[PDB]
Amino acid sequence: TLTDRTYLPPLEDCLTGRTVILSWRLVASALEDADLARLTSPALSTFLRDGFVHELLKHPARVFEPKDLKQEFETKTSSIPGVDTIKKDALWLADAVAINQVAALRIVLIEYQTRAHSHLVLPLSTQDVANIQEAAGVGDLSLLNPASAVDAETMWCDFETEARRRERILATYLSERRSFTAAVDALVTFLLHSAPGQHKDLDSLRRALLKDAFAFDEDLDVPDRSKLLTMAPTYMNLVEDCIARAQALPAKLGESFKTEAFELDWLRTAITEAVHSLSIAFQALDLDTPYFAPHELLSEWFELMNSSLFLESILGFEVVADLAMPARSLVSAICLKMLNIDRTIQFLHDFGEEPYLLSSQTLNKIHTAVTNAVNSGVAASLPVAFAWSLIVHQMHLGYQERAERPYDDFLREQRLDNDAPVEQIAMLATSRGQVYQVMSEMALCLGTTHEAAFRPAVGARARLVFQDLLKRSAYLIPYQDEPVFSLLAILATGRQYWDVTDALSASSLNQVYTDMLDDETLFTQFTMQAINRFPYEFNPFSVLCRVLAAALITNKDKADVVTGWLWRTPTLTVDWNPAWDRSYELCFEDENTNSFRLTRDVDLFGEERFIIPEGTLGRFVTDVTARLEFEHSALALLGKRLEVKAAEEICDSGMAPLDVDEQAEAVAMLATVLRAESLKSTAKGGDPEAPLKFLKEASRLLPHNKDILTVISDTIDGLVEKELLELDGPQIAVLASCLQFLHAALAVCPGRVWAYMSRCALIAGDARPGRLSRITGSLDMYAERFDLLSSAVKLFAALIDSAACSAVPWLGTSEKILSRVALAIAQAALDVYESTTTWRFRSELDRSILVRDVVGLMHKLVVHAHTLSSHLTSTLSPAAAHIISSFLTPPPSASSLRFQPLLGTLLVALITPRATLYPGQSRILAERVTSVLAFCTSLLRAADFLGQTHIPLQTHLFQSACLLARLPAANAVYRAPVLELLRALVEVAGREPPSLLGYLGSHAARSFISLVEGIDKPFGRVEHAVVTWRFFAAVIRN
């Protein structure tokens, strides 16, 4: 009793617009975003609760697989306005690409319902280009498209031809292939790894899917995971199909349509399906984490890794590089998951499914692919190969132990009963730390940063296999830089201070971090090793405190770990100063131990000082440093090391001074832990004075008139003695960290931070021009420089918040101070904003972050336009007037300059290809565009409120209307923003006004009003419906 009544609405409703088809593109978007309003809307909620859809999820071939469905197709098309063309295209497509008629019919109807969208994403016409050329302004990165643009009418006629329509249908077909795998991918995550506190309705939908579609009833003490686990072999078999399709285009399709643009789309589609298929299969295997997989699955899988060299046959082209890393990362991850090195080796030592070790067949299958991959040169296979070497190395042991008076068959088969060749792999992998750098790059790909290709949950659970690999090799490999920086990369994934959050996620997702404390092998061989070598080896311990402090904000049982390391540090490891050679004496216990004892007090940095007591037992680690057994406060000590480093005070008889690198890491580590302590302090059951205590301990054993915050202040002042152009890389990194520390301290000492900013050279004063304003120009925004300005904008923004939030701790400030500092911030912000036109960013994503945060900052000030009355001023009034007056009523050259970042944002939004991976990059871009649109809207509203008649921004936006009308076609997220802006624009101009539709053009106007005439049709969200109608009521005159 399973029908497609919901999956595919009746044909007449699709052609009239009464019912929009829930394309997999729409379904995937809602699931990737876990949007409450979309997923719990009746339309999409019924779609997901439907039994027919469920069978498609579990049987993915059926979605497009060809089959005899002529009767169903004829009944759906017979007896119902253009149906002749619809029925025609569906049959042509079904035969061309070998898909069943019903599936093809759905593709053709999606193209028909998205025809107004496809028209608006066409290259701009000659007229539109001229309009935006004037919007650019009088001035001369926002490099515009070429002059190949033609008349709008010419394009429309071409857009309606059978040839183009067929191309869009083919494009839609491939788009739905990608979006279906993606929707299932996101679906699995939504089901297995949703965050606690989920909304009631959303939780009901999650449980109803697990129970009805997978017989997974959470109300049971142990639910049945059978149907979920079958998703792995299901979608593993789909990965094989993608390999085949990528190597063979459709047979019957005509060469008219087999253009280079289609060949690439066909290839990228196959890779994308494989990645999301790998992501689905991995999450499925992960559900059964401790247990082994059926040996037949590995045998089948590694047989495919052999013929395709772990999918390298598909990823050989450079045009698929952005998809290659995601694929390689999950191929390596999913291979390691099945091998299960931890439970494999543990089974070899000690005595569900049977381990694949008991099947000499599978062991040969694996060894063939591994051997083939290494000899071929597959760099991505080293983590799998290195993992396979350690397994064979232990099998070689278990065989010799019994040679004194199933896998044995494999050892005798592959010349392993006796010597060596396996060791060649273990060396090629670790030679020059290759395998360790591979895992470090796969960590980022599977990371938490906004540059990760996959969602957090997939990355969190997947990085565990690379952690298990290091776990088992830790006892057999010495503690070195390569196997340690690799783990730190697996843990940190290049995260920064700004990525700290008290957001509670699924419990199982923090296992990679809690295993550093719960797993003996990792805890003793990595965590303790990092502690016992600090501060001689600075970074390893600093990163752990920085990472675990941010990851355990929500963990009660482990809330005192990092603080327990900073307070009450057990040991101290420093480079030995010859000046102490008279203050120790060996113990003569063991000739190898080399232990000793102190005979005189040692004064580091040689009131309240830091002294290592006489009679403290110690030990010399290497002769080519000493690990003293001395419990102390590494936080208090570090605070003093920063004070010394800031003052440039040499201490011949004391410990070594902080390196400039160590300095930046040190401050960043303090800012993170402080931020983590102030986040948990305001939570239920936390110590509300936790951050103050953290500052006091770091201020201990400092001069009486000096606390840790004074040191950071002095450090900033000292570095800005020169100008930013003269500073060095690591020095600029120190500034960034110091600004991140002010941000964390702002939450607990607002009066101190504000007090310092009033005399900070970075921003202008009533007597100084400001240092930041000097960095503007044509410089390049590379990592150290960008981190500085990014952190500066975020800090400036956080300050504006505290000024507005405070309606009445703050000792050391006044209204004059906040006013002047806020105004200087407004001036610095606008300078950074104007400079984004000329700076060279490492990546457009970097510019999207900066423009997002700067625009947000200036927006916070534009919102205070209501305070611009004589008897209603506030501390933000001057700052607000500086922004408002700079965008409203500026002269031409400045008007053009201040509009290009906005125009550049609109352009980047239209030329950025849609994607189902890299969700973080996509979100950031949307936040950028939404900021620009909202910022422009409030400026127009503020102009109307303040009486400003002549507004260049009004003219700038009309000439950019051709871009605004196309944004909702590029991404539905922009529909409501664009409509609220166009409404504000029309309303403000109305007070013979300009014609919105006159600027768009006859053709664009028609398709735009068509898109907007959907009125959030598929979902029917109230807030979206009201926005649409206020727009129609204000813009479209009956």
mmCIF file of N, CA and C in Angstrom, residues 421-523:
data_model
loop_
_atom_site.group_PDB
_atom_site.id
_atom_site.type_symbol
_atom_site.label_atom_id
_atom_site.label_comp_id
_atom_site.label_asym_id
_atom_site.label_seq_id
_atom_site.Cartn_x
_atom_site.Cartn_y
_atom_site.Cartn_z
ATOM 1 N N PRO A 421 59.001 -7.574 4.329
ATOM 2 C CA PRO A 421 58.325 -6.764 3.303
ATOM 3 C C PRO A 421 57.212 -5.902 3.868
ATOM 4 N N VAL A 422 56.537 -6.362 4.923
ATOM 5 C CA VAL A 422 55.533 -5.534 5.582
ATOM 6 C C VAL A 422 56.185 -4.316 6.222
ATOM 7 N N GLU A 423 57.386 -4.487 6.781
ATOM 8 C CA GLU A 423 58.087 -3.360 7.386
ATOM 9 C C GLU A 423 58.379 -2.274 6.360
ATOM 10 N N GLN A 424 58.518 -2.651 5.087
ATOM 11 C CA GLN A 424 58.727 -1.657 4.038
ATOM 12 C C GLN A 424 57.562 -0.678 3.975
ATOM 13 N N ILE A 425 56.342 -1.170 4.200
ATOM 14 C CA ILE A 425 55.173 -0.296 4.208
ATOM 15 C C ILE A 425 55.176 0.578 5.456
ATOM 16 N N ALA A 426 55.459 -0.024 6.615
ATOM 17 C CA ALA A 426 55.475 0.735 7.861
ATOM 18 C C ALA A 426 56.496 1.863 7.820
ATOM 19 N N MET A 427 57.547 1.717 7.015
ATOM 20 C CA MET A 427 58.560 2.757 6.888
ATOM 21 C C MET A 427 58.182 3.788 5.828
ATOM 22 N N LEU A 428 57.749 3.332 4.649
ATOM 23 C CA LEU A 428 57.313 4.264 3.613
ATOM 24 C C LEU A 428 56.241 5.209 4.139
ATOM 25 N N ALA A 429 55.348 4.703 4.989
ATOM 26 C CA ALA A 429 54.306 5.545 5.566
ATOM 27 C C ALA A 429 54.903 6.577 6.513
ATOM 28 N N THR A 430 55.669 6.121 7.503
ATOM 29 C CA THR A 430 56.239 7.016 8.503
ATOM 30 C C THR A 430 57.470 7.763 8.007
ATOM 31 N N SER A 431 58.066 7.342 6.893
ATOM 32 C CA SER A 431 59.232 8.033 6.359
ATOM 33 C C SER A 431 58.898 9.496 6.100
ATOM 34 N N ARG A 432 59.654 10.393 6.731
ATOM 35 C CA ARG A 432 59.438 11.833 6.619
ATOM 36 C C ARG A 432 58.062 12.247 7.130
ATOM 37 N N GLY A 433 57.448 11.421 7.972
ATOM 38 C CA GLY A 433 56.151 11.750 8.543
ATOM 39 C C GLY A 433 55.062 11.946 7.512
ATOM 40 N N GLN A 434 55.078 11.150 6.442
ATOM 41 C CA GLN A 434 54.069 11.286 5.396
ATOM 42 C C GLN A 434 52.680 10.957 5.930
ATOM 43 N N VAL A 435 52.510 9.746 6.467
ATOM 44 C CA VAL A 435 51.202 9.325 6.960
ATOM 45 C C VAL A 435 50.690 10.284 8.023
ATOM 46 N N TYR A 436 51.595 10.894 8.793
ATOM 47 C CA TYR A 436 51.170 11.799 9.857
ATOM 48 C C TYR A 436 50.696 13.135 9.301
ATOM 49 N N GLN A 437 51.305 13.607 8.213
ATOM 50 C CA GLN A 437 50.806 14.808 7.557
ATOM 51 C C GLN A 437 49.501 14.533 6.818
ATOM 52 N N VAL A 438 49.350 13.333 6.254
ATOM 53 C CA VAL A 438 48.085 12.959 5.627
ATOM 54 C C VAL A 438 46.952 13.055 6.638
ATOM 55 N N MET A 439 47.098 12.372 7.777
ATOM 56 C CA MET A 439 46.061 12.415 8.802
ATOM 57 C C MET A 439 45.807 13.838 9.274
ATOM 58 N N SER A 440 46.832 14.691 9.246
ATOM 59 C CA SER A 440 46.648 16.078 9.654
ATOM 60 C C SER A 440 45.786 16.835 8.650
ATOM 61 N N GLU A 441 45.951 16.548 7.357
ATOM 62 C CA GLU A 441 45.126 17.202 6.346
ATOM 63 C C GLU A 441 43.716 16.629 6.334
ATOM 64 N N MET A 442 43.581 15.314 6.522
ATOM 65 C CA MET A 442 42.254 14.719 6.630
ATOM 66 C C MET A 442 41.531 15.201 7.879
ATOM 67 N N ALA A 443 42.278 15.573 8.918
ATOM 68 C CA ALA A 443 41.660 16.103 10.127
ATOM 69 C C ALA A 443 40.933 17.410 9.838
ATOM 70 N N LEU A 444 41.601 18.336 9.146
ATOM 71 C CA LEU A 444 40.951 19.586 8.766
ATOM 72 C C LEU A 444 39.710 19.317 7.929
ATOM 73 N N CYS A 445 39.852 18.497 6.887
ATOM 74 C CA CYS A 445 38.711 18.130 6.060
ATOM 75 C C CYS A 445 37.549 17.652 6.921
ATOM 76 N N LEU A 446 37.832 16.761 7.873
ATOM 77 C CA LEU A 446 36.846 16.277 8.831
ATOM 78 C C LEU A 446 36.808 17.117 10.102
ATOM 79 N N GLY A 447 37.158 18.402 10.016
ATOM 80 C CA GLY A 447 37.354 19.218 11.195
ATOM 81 C C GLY A 447 36.115 19.989 11.609
ATOM 82 N N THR A 448 36.286 20.778 12.672
ATOM 83 C CA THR A 448 35.227 21.625 13.204
ATOM 84 C C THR A 448 35.281 23.047 12.666
ATOM 85 N N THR A 449 36.419 23.459 12.116
ATOM 86 C CA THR A 449 36.547 24.789 11.542
ATOM 87 C C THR A 449 35.494 25.010 10.460
ATOM 88 N N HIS A 450 35.295 26.282 10.113
ATOM 89 C CA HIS A 450 34.394 26.629 9.022
ATOM 90 C C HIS A 450 34.937 26.212 7.663
ATOM 91 N N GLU A 451 36.174 25.722 7.595
ATOM 92 C CA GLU A 451 36.758 25.231 6.355
ATOM 93 C C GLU A 451 36.625 23.721 6.206
ATOM 94 N N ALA A 452 35.916 23.061 7.117
ATOM 95 C CA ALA A 452 35.714 21.625 7.000
ATOM 96 C C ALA A 452 34.738 21.325 5.869
ATOM 97 N N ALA A 453 34.996 20.231 5.155
ATOM 98 C CA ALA A 453 34.130 19.854 4.045
ATOM 99 C C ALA A 453 32.827 19.226 4.524
ATOM 100 N N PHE A 454 32.837 18.584 5.688
ATOM 101 C CA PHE A 454 31.688 17.849 6.195
ATOM 102 C C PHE A 454 31.104 18.541 7.420
ATOM 103 N N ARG A 455 29.917 18.085 7.811
ATOM 104 C CA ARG A 455 29.267 18.609 8.995
ATOM 105 C C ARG A 455 30.047 18.214 10.245
ATOM 106 N N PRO A 456 29.881 18.963 11.340
ATOM 107 C CA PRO A 456 30.603 18.619 12.578
ATOM 108 C C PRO A 456 30.462 17.163 12.998
ATOM 109 N N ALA A 457 29.237 16.634 13.027
ATOM 110 C CA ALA A 457 29.028 15.285 13.546
ATOM 111 C C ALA A 457 29.821 14.254 12.753
ATOM 112 N N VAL A 458 29.810 14.357 11.423
ATOM 113 C CA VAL A 458 30.543 13.400 10.600
ATOM 114 C C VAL A 458 32.038 13.507 10.872
ATOM 115 N N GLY A 459 32.542 14.733 11.015
ATOM 116 C CA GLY A 459 33.954 14.908 11.308
ATOM 117 C C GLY A 459 34.330 14.402 12.687
ATOM 118 N N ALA A 460 33.488 14.682 13.686
ATOM 119 C CA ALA A 460 33.783 14.266 15.053
ATOM 120 C C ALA A 460 33.969 12.756 15.144
ATOM 121 N N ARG A 461 32.987 11.990 14.660
ATOM 122 C CA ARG A 461 33.061 10.537 14.773
ATOM 123 C C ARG A 461 34.126 9.950 13.856
ATOM 124 N N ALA A 462 34.388 10.585 12.714
ATOM 125 C CA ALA A 462 35.338 10.016 11.762
ATOM 126 C C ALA A 462 36.773 10.175 12.246
ATOM 127 N N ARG A 463 37.098 11.313 12.856
ATOM 128 C CA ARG A 463 38.448 11.509 13.368
ATOM 129 C C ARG A 463 38.838 10.469 14.412
ATOM 130 N N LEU A 464 37.879 9.710 14.949
ATOM 131 C CA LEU A 464 38.211 8.700 15.948
ATOM 132 C C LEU A 464 39.078 7.590 15.370
ATOM 133 N N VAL A 465 38.887 7.241 14.096
ATOM 134 C CA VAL A 465 39.677 6.160 13.515
ATOM 135 C C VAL A 465 41.142 6.566 13.428
ATOM 136 N N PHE A 466 41.409 7.825 13.073
ATOM 137 C CA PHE A 466 42.785 8.305 13.024
ATOM 138 C C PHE A 466 43.371 8.436 14.422
ATOM 139 N N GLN A 467 42.519 8.651 15.424
ATOM 140 C CA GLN A 467 42.980 8.664 16.806
ATOM 141 C C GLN A 467 43.276 7.250 17.293
ATOM 142 N N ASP A 468 42.411 6.291 16.953
ATOM 143 C CA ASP A 468 42.677 4.897 17.292
ATOM 144 C C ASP A 468 43.983 4.424 16.671
ATOM 145 N N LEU A 469 44.285 4.886 15.456
ATOM 146 C CA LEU A 469 45.521 4.476 14.797
ATOM 147 C C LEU A 469 46.737 4.934 15.591
ATOM 148 N N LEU A 470 46.759 6.210 15.985
ATOM 149 C CA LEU A 470 47.849 6.709 16.816
ATOM 150 C C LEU A 470 47.871 6.020 18.174
ATOM 151 N N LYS A 471 46.697 5.681 18.706
ATOM 152 C CA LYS A 471 46.623 4.991 19.989
ATOM 153 C C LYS A 471 47.416 3.689 19.961
ATOM 154 N N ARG A 472 47.215 2.876 18.922
ATOM 155 C CA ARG A 472 47.860 1.568 18.866
ATOM 156 C C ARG A 472 49.329 1.658 18.476
ATOM 157 N N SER A 473 49.720 2.689 17.729
ATOM 158 C CA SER A 473 51.120 2.882 17.380
ATOM 159 C C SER A 473 51.895 3.649 18.444
ATOM 160 N N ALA A 474 51.210 4.214 19.443
ATOM 161 C CA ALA A 474 51.889 5.041 20.434
ATOM 162 C C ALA A 474 52.903 4.232 21.235
ATOM 163 N N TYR A 475 52.526 3.030 21.672
ATOM 164 C CA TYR A 475 53.445 2.212 22.457
ATOM 165 C C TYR A 475 54.624 1.725 21.624
ATOM 166 N N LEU A 476 54.453 1.620 20.306
ATOM 167 C CA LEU A 476 55.493 1.091 19.434
ATOM 168 C C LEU A 476 56.278 2.177 18.706
ATOM 169 N N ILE A 477 55.860 3.436 18.802
ATOM 170 C CA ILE A 477 56.561 4.540 18.147
ATOM 171 C C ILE A 477 56.968 5.558 19.208
ATOM 172 N N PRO A 478 58.173 6.125 19.151
ATOM 173 C CA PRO A 478 58.567 7.113 20.160
ATOM 174 C C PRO A 478 57.762 8.402 20.050
ATOM 175 N N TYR A 479 57.703 9.115 21.173
ATOM 176 C CA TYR A 479 57.050 10.419 21.243
ATOM 177 C C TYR A 479 57.856 11.431 20.435
ATOM 178 N N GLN A 480 57.357 11.791 19.254
ATOM 179 C CA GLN A 480 58.064 12.670 18.330
ATOM 180 C C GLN A 480 57.137 13.795 17.886
ATOM 181 N N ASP A 481 57.677 14.701 17.067
ATOM 182 C CA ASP A 481 56.892 15.834 16.587
ATOM 183 C C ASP A 481 55.801 15.382 15.623
ATOM 184 N N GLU A 482 56.147 14.512 14.673
ATOM 185 C CA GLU A 482 55.178 14.103 13.657
ATOM 186 C C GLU A 482 53.971 13.395 14.254
ATOM 187 N N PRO A 483 54.121 12.346 15.070
ATOM 188 C CA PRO A 483 52.936 11.678 15.633
ATOM 189 C C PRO A 483 52.226 12.480 16.712
ATOM 190 N N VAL A 484 52.781 13.604 17.149
ATOM 191 C CA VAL A 484 52.151 14.448 18.161
ATOM 192 C C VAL A 484 51.431 15.630 17.527
ATOM 193 N N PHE A 485 52.098 16.344 16.619
ATOM 194 C CA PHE A 485 51.417 17.405 15.888
ATOM 195 C C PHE A 485 50.257 16.846 15.076
ATOM 196 N N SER A 486 50.375 15.599 14.616
ATOM 197 C CA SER A 486 49.267 14.956 13.920
ATOM 198 C C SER A 486 48.058 14.821 14.835
ATOM 199 N N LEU A 487 48.273 14.341 16.062
ATOM 200 C CA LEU A 487 47.168 14.221 17.006
ATOM 201 C C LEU A 487 46.600 15.589 17.361
ATOM 202 N N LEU A 488 47.473 16.568 17.607
ATOM 203 C CA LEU A 488 47.001 17.918 17.889
ATOM 204 C C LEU A 488 46.188 18.464 16.723
ATOM 205 N N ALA A 489 46.580 18.127 15.493
ATOM 206 C CA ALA A 489 45.782 18.511 14.334
ATOM 207 C C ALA A 489 44.443 17.786 14.331
ATOM 208 N N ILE A 490 44.437 16.506 14.714
ATOM 209 C CA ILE A 490 43.184 15.762 14.814
ATOM 210 C C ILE A 490 42.273 16.386 15.862
ATOM 211 N N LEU A 491 42.847 16.946 16.925
ATOM 212 C CA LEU A 491 42.059 17.502 18.016
ATOM 213 C C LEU A 491 41.640 18.945 17.751
ATOM 214 N N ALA A 492 42.585 19.795 17.344
ATOM 215 C CA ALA A 492 42.290 21.215 17.187
ATOM 216 C C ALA A 492 41.668 21.518 15.830
ATOM 217 N N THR A 493 42.127 20.843 14.778
ATOM 218 C CA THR A 493 41.647 21.090 13.418
ATOM 219 C C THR A 493 41.718 22.577 13.079
ATOM 220 N N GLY A 494 42.802 23.220 13.510
ATOM 221 C CA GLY A 494 43.044 24.611 13.165
ATOM 222 C C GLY A 494 42.017 25.579 13.705
ATOM 223 N N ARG A 495 41.436 25.293 14.867
ATOM 224 C CA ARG A 495 40.434 26.177 15.439
ATOM 225 C C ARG A 495 41.096 27.370 16.124
ATOM 226 N N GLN A 496 40.295 28.405 16.360
ATOM 227 C CA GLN A 496 40.755 29.660 16.940
ATOM 228 C C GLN A 496 39.952 29.978 18.199
ATOM 229 N N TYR A 497 40.297 31.107 18.822
ATOM 230 C CA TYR A 497 39.580 31.552 20.011
ATOM 231 C C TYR A 497 38.107 31.801 19.710
ATOM 232 N N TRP A 498 37.810 32.355 18.535
ATOM 233 C CA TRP A 498 36.443 32.731 18.199
ATOM 234 C C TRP A 498 35.534 31.527 17.982
ATOM 235 N N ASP A 499 36.086 30.317 17.926
ATOM 236 C CA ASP A 499 35.297 29.104 17.764
ATOM 237 C C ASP A 499 34.876 28.489 19.094
ATOM 238 N N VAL A 500 35.123 29.166 20.209
ATOM 239 C CA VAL A 500 34.718 28.662 21.516
ATOM 240 C C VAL A 500 33.228 28.911 21.699
ATOM 241 N N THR A 501 32.526 27.924 22.253
ATOM 242 C CA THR A 501 31.087 28.046 22.438
ATOM 243 C C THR A 501 30.625 27.063 23.503
ATOM 244 N N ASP A 502 29.591 27.464 24.241
ATOM 245 C CA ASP A 502 28.945 26.605 25.221
ATOM 246 C C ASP A 502 27.814 25.780 24.612
ATOM 247 N N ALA A 503 27.775 25.666 23.286
ATOM 248 C CA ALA A 503 26.707 24.938 22.612
ATOM 249 C C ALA A 503 26.796 23.456 22.943
ATOM 250 N N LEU A 504 25.707 22.900 23.461
ATOM 251 C CA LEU A 504 25.648 21.484 23.793
ATOM 252 C C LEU A 504 25.254 20.684 22.558
ATOM 253 N N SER A 505 26.073 19.698 22.214
ATOM 254 C CA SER A 505 25.825 18.804 21.093
ATOM 255 C C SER A 505 25.642 17.382 21.616
ATOM 256 N N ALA A 506 25.416 16.449 20.692
ATOM 257 C CA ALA A 506 25.192 15.062 21.076
ATOM 258 C C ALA A 506 26.369 14.538 21.886
ATOM 259 N N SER A 507 26.056 13.778 22.938
ATOM 260 C CA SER A 507 27.081 13.342 23.881
ATOM 261 C C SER A 507 28.200 12.581 23.179
ATOM 262 N N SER A 508 27.843 11.650 22.293
ATOM 263 C CA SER A 508 28.840 10.791 21.665
ATOM 264 C C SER A 508 29.815 11.553 20.776
ATOM 265 N N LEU A 509 29.545 12.823 20.462
ATOM 266 C CA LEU A 509 30.388 13.559 19.527
ATOM 267 C C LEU A 509 31.654 14.116 20.167
ATOM 268 N N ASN A 510 31.716 14.184 21.498
ATOM 269 C CA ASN A 510 32.900 14.665 22.199
ATOM 270 C C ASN A 510 33.811 13.528 22.649
ATOM 271 N N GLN A 511 33.676 12.347 22.047
ATOM 272 C CA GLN A 511 34.485 11.209 22.467
ATOM 273 C C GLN A 511 35.952 11.406 22.104
ATOM 274 N N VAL A 512 36.224 12.045 20.964
ATOM 275 C CA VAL A 512 37.607 12.265 20.545
ATOM 276 C C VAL A 512 38.365 13.075 21.585
ATOM 277 N N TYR A 513 37.666 13.923 22.337
ATOM 278 C CA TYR A 513 38.303 14.755 23.349
ATOM 279 C C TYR A 513 38.322 14.087 24.719
ATOM 280 N N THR A 514 37.242 13.396 25.093
ATOM 281 C CA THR A 514 37.207 12.719 26.384
ATOM 282 C C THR A 514 38.083 11.473 26.410
ATOM 283 N N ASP A 515 38.355 10.864 25.253
ATOM 284 C CA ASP A 515 39.262 9.721 25.221
ATOM 285 C C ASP A 515 40.692 10.118 25.553
ATOM 286 N N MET A 516 41.055 11.387 25.356
ATOM 287 C CA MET A 516 42.356 11.863 25.806
ATOM 288 C C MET A 516 42.505 11.743 27.316
ATOM 289 N N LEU A 517 41.391 11.657 28.046
ATOM 290 C CA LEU A 517 41.405 11.514 29.493
ATOM 291 C C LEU A 517 40.865 10.176 29.979
ATOM 292 N N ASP A 518 40.026 9.505 29.187
ATOM 293 C CA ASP A 518 39.410 8.249 29.598
ATOM 294 C C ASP A 518 40.146 7.015 29.092
ATOM 295 N N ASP A 519 40.987 7.149 28.070
ATOM 296 C CA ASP A 519 41.735 6.028 27.513
ATOM 297 C C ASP A 519 43.152 6.045 28.076
ATOM 298 N N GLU A 520 43.538 4.962 28.753
ATOM 299 C CA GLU A 520 44.861 4.902 29.370
ATOM 300 C C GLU A 520 45.959 5.117 28.336
ATOM 301 N N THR A 521 45.887 4.399 27.213
ATOM 302 C CA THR A 521 46.936 4.491 26.204
ATOM 303 C C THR A 521 47.129 5.931 25.745
ATOM 304 N N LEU A 522 46.035 6.622 25.418
ATOM 305 C CA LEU A 522 46.146 8.014 24.994
ATOM 306 C C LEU A 522 46.534 8.918 26.157
ATOM 307 N N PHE A 523 45.908 8.726 27.319
ATOM 308 C CA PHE A 523 46.171 9.602 28.455
ATOM 309 C C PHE A 523 47.635 9.540 28.877
#
